[PDB]
Amino acid sequence: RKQELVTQNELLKQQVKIFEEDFQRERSDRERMNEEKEELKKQVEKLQAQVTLTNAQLKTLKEEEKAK
């Protein structure tokens, strides 16, 4: 019984350690994914600025023409 309970003690401790390691790896992957999300947000910002600029250039080009 004490050998049986020490056996379960050992197996339970090992299961806890594995689960804690699994969690830390999942957390690390989630951090990386945030970083990738943040770089996508910068790309969106950059592209929105390009579209805004080109739209303004298009309008301007048409007014430069009418000014002829």
Binding site: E20, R30, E31, N34, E38
Partner: protein
Amino acid sequence: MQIFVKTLTGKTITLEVEPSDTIENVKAKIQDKEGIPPDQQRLIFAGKQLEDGRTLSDYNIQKESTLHLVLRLRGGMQIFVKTLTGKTITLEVEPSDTIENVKAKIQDKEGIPPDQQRLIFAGKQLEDGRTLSDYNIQKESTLHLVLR
């Protein structure tokens, strides 16, 4: 009523409670003494998990009883803090955390003194006496850490 709370480490503390106190109040008391958020706490008695809404009387807990505290690996709310070097750290926070509380958590993880930390969110540097909720900083928001 006076109760012990003990972890799987050697850690043990004493709490001033009443038999009418709910488990959620006991968790709030543990936060006050020990700095452990309630959402990171699981309290155990006679091998079973105590529900937040129940009183201590509901589990037949008497004075000089020992409650067992098992800490979670996380709570409900995390935020991400990005450094200039592209490193990310995630912090376990509550919306009631002050900016100084957040800086102390960063010091805990990375060793950087709070007075050398500037936290930025939505282009604004964050003031020490204000909370996360004051800036509408939500779950999984990203703050930027810049060093002085």
